[PDB]
A paper describes a structure:
The NatAM structure was determined to 1.7 Å resolution using the Zn2+ anomalous signal. The asymmetric unit contains two monomers of NatAM, which PISA indicates form a homodimer. Residues 1–493 in chain A and 2–494 chain B were traced, and the monomers superimpose with an rmsd of 0.238 Å over 486 Cα atoms. The larger domain (residues 71–399) has a central core reminiscent of a distorted (β/α)8 barrel. Asp345 contributes to the coordination sphere but with a zinc–oxygen distance of 2.7 Å, giving a distorted trigonal bipyramid. The water molecule hydrogen bonds to Asp345 and His290. NatAM, belongs to the amidohydrolase family that is known to hydrolyse C−O, P−O, P−S, C−N, C−S, and C−Cl bonds.
We reconstituted the biosynthesis of the benzoxazole moiety found in nataxazole by adding two enzymes (NatL2, NatAM), to 3‐HAA, ATP, and Mg2+. We have determined the structures of both NatL2 (homologue of BomJ) and NatAM (homologue of BomN) from the antitumor nataxazole pathway. We show NatL2 catalyzes ester not, as previously reported, amide formation; the amide is a shunt product. NatAM catalyzes benzoxazole from this ester by a mechanism that we propose involves shuttling of protons to control the fate of a hemiorthoamide intermediate.
Residue numbers in the entry:
A (entry chain A): 1 to 493
B (entry chain B): 2 to 494
The structure:
């Protein structure tokens, strides 16, 4: 795939020193970064290349651009199959009758638990062609917003359809399976077992076997538990044994909601982080989604275990979640030295991407502390790249522009009014830009996106296949009448 | 003449926060005549005089969202400080940044001293520098959909900003800089810096000059820079001026954690109580920030039916804690005080109204665990109708209703961010911003189309601004040409 020199722009590395190079350069050979730094230092690396390699060198003039490492979104859910029903296309245009529901008002724990336990049934209701079309468009939207490495933490989609989508798109993907074996029902004093733990674990073992063979280096997998509410002691024990035996990372959602601790005590006799700790899951392998509603003992367990938190401050308000300011635990654990990364979470229609989440962290963590240095723009970038990659156990290959790492990078245009006179274009990007301002996306030295358009894929073709799949799934599986769906899709066209 | 904008989703920000899918706006000359469902507005077109119904300009807005023009009632022209104020001369790396100025609770001595130096710098800029910088600064607000702009104290010449607004075709509430005290660290009491009567005479001169304006686009509103820099005589003088001429009034108060202690030490009393003693806590008051208020001061604001302008998009990067440290502004909004959203300002482009609406939607909802506390339509009302009420301009602007000025925005809704969403304002708050404003109409006149000036050339405004900034920065701020010329030499086009 040959050599590429990207020169002249401001280069953000997200390396250990959070290095920024004005008039910087990145030299890539095949899939790897070979040199990054001042243009003059990188030109010395170009002159050291084999003559046959230097002769094929592609020079990209990035003088009116900012270069970033590819975003690593380690906490994401494929949910686009629910685009008509889940807070989606059938809502009234007026928001005035909206109610506090689902995750809002501290969490409707019965409704959340019941909803999560229904995923297996809905996944089985979609065809493999519907699953592939929805996955490919959903994952394209992440790639288009600069996500080069995507982490599944439990999707309403078929795992191997999402793996096939990632293979076709050219992006990196950490695949998972849906894992729920208990429900918290309103008529009961105790959790109701819905599945055999061994069956849930066999489903992940099948995925692990299928991606073990992948030759691209772009596909990994990571087991998750959907939510500690929907987790038996047997599933927790089984997950601990699986991640030890196969040397894997582990993910779950825990301390996500004000009402979680009381539901966990009532139905399981113990709170989320303590149940994980008794199974041996609170350790360096753990990425905890949200992880804000933790008492002092649970905070100390996370610190002692050197666990990881994925935080989604771009999307809490619109869900009615209070996982930032009600406890202030995640910023406090970050100050105490816990690894904290930024993720999008997900929804059934496009929501905040990584770029929007970086802005949210920069605004919100700094405002809470009355400190513009708590999250610097380069910290928000590290939290969406290098630190995220560390939580996913992919920081061997991705998350920073350093020699020997994968050539995964973004170009953003910096020639318009938003960037004028600013020596810190990442700051202008966090003020006034977002996902739609990502211009070029390169993964393993291959250009996947240029001018905001697919190079090897057509967004228009992915959209058409996604809409066709959504029509089939929505009318057949969700039982929304074709008479209500077809007119909406006809007005897109 | 008559213009019909039809087919899109129309947000009115009327008293019911009305949203019309497949809506229309009919304008005749400068005014809205009908707004509602496209079919209802076509009946209004048929009820027009036939000569008017003939010569109707039809704008197909079927793939667009229509909004009222944004009303940014709390803004400062600060672009003259682009080289020194968190500006163009900073290192590209942010890693050495320190907590300064407004951060860490507020450096009250430094803030007071800084504000008291504005008059000197305003006198140092030429009328031509003032006009060029004002016109570009105010263009950036217009390009981001601001149709009505409120000056709350600028580092610029008042008549230059009035001339800039007249030239651009936007609405402007002009003010003068007002500071007559400084908090000096070597003294136990405030130091009087100017005669109150002289400060008031400067505003009286502006009021006289804009009294004659025939456009209906120019008003004025006196402000006090900050209650730290305000003598009892200036407050009493302002109260008499706004009563005699029936004007609104604006100031910054309760902005910083360290304000109350500095106000007690140097003035013997906190900000809102000092305003109440002068008779300024009433329906005319727009209080900037207004978060660090005790229970008695909150009750004074409620009793007075005063107004708060909140800038949650920009607190974090300034190290301000005017949202979460006290929670007072969301609490006063819940209690039924008028609260609007504003950008505040900086010396380089920062968060516009679109970014501030997103911030409010995320941040107020997250604090309350309530996705309904600020609905997207509430964020819009806070940036339009409610802002106009605080500025006392809601007679003519802030909502799309019959008899109001034809001030509106068109945003394209045909890309991936909007696909299948019956609530394009929600998609706009998730994933769009100032740069996604397509068309801006003021009094029925198109000023911006496709994000470009219709009557003005953005490239020409930029070059005049850069020429003026070079002169002012080297001559008045005493930055060597050797530091300025290289930055200007790098400017993209
Ligand atoms: Zn270096
Ligand atoms: Zn050297
Ligand atoms: Zn219940
Ligand atoms: Zn087994
Ligand atoms: Zn293995
Ligand atoms: Zn095995
Ligand atoms: Zn136990
Ligand atoms: Zn504590
Ligand atoms: Zn999640
Ligand atoms: Zn590692
Ligand atoms: Zn530059
Ligand atoms: Zn001092
Ligand atoms: Zn002069
Ligand atoms: Zn003049
Ligand atoms: Zn001093
Ligand atoms: Zn008078
Ligand atoms: Zn008068
Ligand atoms: Zn007094
Ligand atoms: Zn109180
Ligand atoms: Zn202000
Ligand atoms: Zn309300
Ligand atoms: Zn009014």
């Amino acid at each position: 795939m040959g050599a590429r020199l990207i020169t002249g722009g401001t280069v953000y590395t997200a390396d250990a020193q959070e290095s920024v190079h004005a008039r910087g350069a990145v030299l890539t050979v095949d899939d790897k970064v070979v040199a990054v730094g001042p243009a003059v230092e990188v030109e010395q690396a170009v002159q050291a290349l084999d003559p046959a390699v230097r002769a094929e060198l592609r020079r990209l003039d990035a003088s009116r651009m900012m270069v970033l490492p590819g975003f690593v979104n380690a906490h994401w859910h494929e949910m686009f199959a629910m685009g008509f029903t889940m807070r989606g296309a059938l809502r009234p245009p007026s928001d005035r009758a909206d109610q506090v529901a689902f995750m809002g008002g501290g969490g409707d724990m019965h409704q959340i638990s019941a909803t999560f336990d229904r995923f297996d049934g809905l996944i089985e209701a979609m065809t493999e062609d519907e699953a592939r079309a929805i996955a490919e468009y959903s994952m394209w939207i992440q790639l288009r917003g600069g996500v080069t490495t995507l982490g599944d933490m439990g999707s309403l989609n078929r795992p191997l359809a999402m793996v096939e989508a990632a293979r076709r798109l050219g992006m990196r993907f950490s695949a998972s399976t849906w894992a729920s074996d208990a429900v918290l029902a309103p008529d009961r004093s105790r959790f109701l077992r819905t599945r055999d733990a061994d069956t849930v674990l066999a489903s992940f073992e099948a995925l692990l076997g299928a991606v073990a063979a992948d030759p691209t280096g772009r596909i990994r997998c990571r087991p998750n538990v959907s939510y500690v509410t929907n987790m038996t002691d047997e599933l927790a024990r089984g997950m601990a044994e699986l991640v030890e035996r196969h040397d894997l990372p582990f993910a779950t959602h825990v301390g996500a909601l004000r009402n979680e601790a009381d539901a966990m005590r009532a139905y399981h006799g113990e709170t989320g982080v303590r149940r994980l700790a008794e199974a041996g899951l609170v350790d360096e392998r753990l990425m905890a989604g949200h992880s804000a509603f933790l008492d002092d003992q649970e905070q100390k367990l996370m610190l002692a275990g050197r666990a990881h938190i994925s935080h989604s401050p771009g999307k809490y308000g619109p869900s009615g979640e209070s996982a930032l300011t009600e406890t202030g635990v995640v910023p406090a654990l970050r100050r105490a030295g816990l690894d904290v990364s930024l993720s999008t979470d997900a929804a059934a229609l496009p929501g905040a991407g990584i770029a929007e989440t970086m802005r949210a962290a920069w605004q919100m963590y700094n405002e809470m502390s009355a400190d513009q240095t708590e999250v610097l723009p380069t910290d928000a970038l590290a939290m969406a790249t290098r630190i995220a990659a560390k939580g996913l156990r992919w920081d061997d290959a991705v998350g920073s522009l350093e020699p020997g790492k994968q050539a995964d990078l973004l170009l953003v245009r910096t020639d318009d009014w938003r960037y004028l006179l600013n020596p810190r274009p990442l700051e202008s990007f966090l003020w006034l830009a977002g996902s739609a301002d990502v211009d070029t996306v390169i993964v393993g030295g291959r250009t996947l996106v240029e001018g905001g358009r697919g190079v090897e894929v057509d967004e228009a073709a992915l959209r058409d296949r996604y809409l066709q799949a959504l029509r089939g799934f929505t009318t057949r599986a969700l039982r929304v009448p074709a008479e209500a769906v077809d007119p909406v899709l006809a007005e897109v066209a």
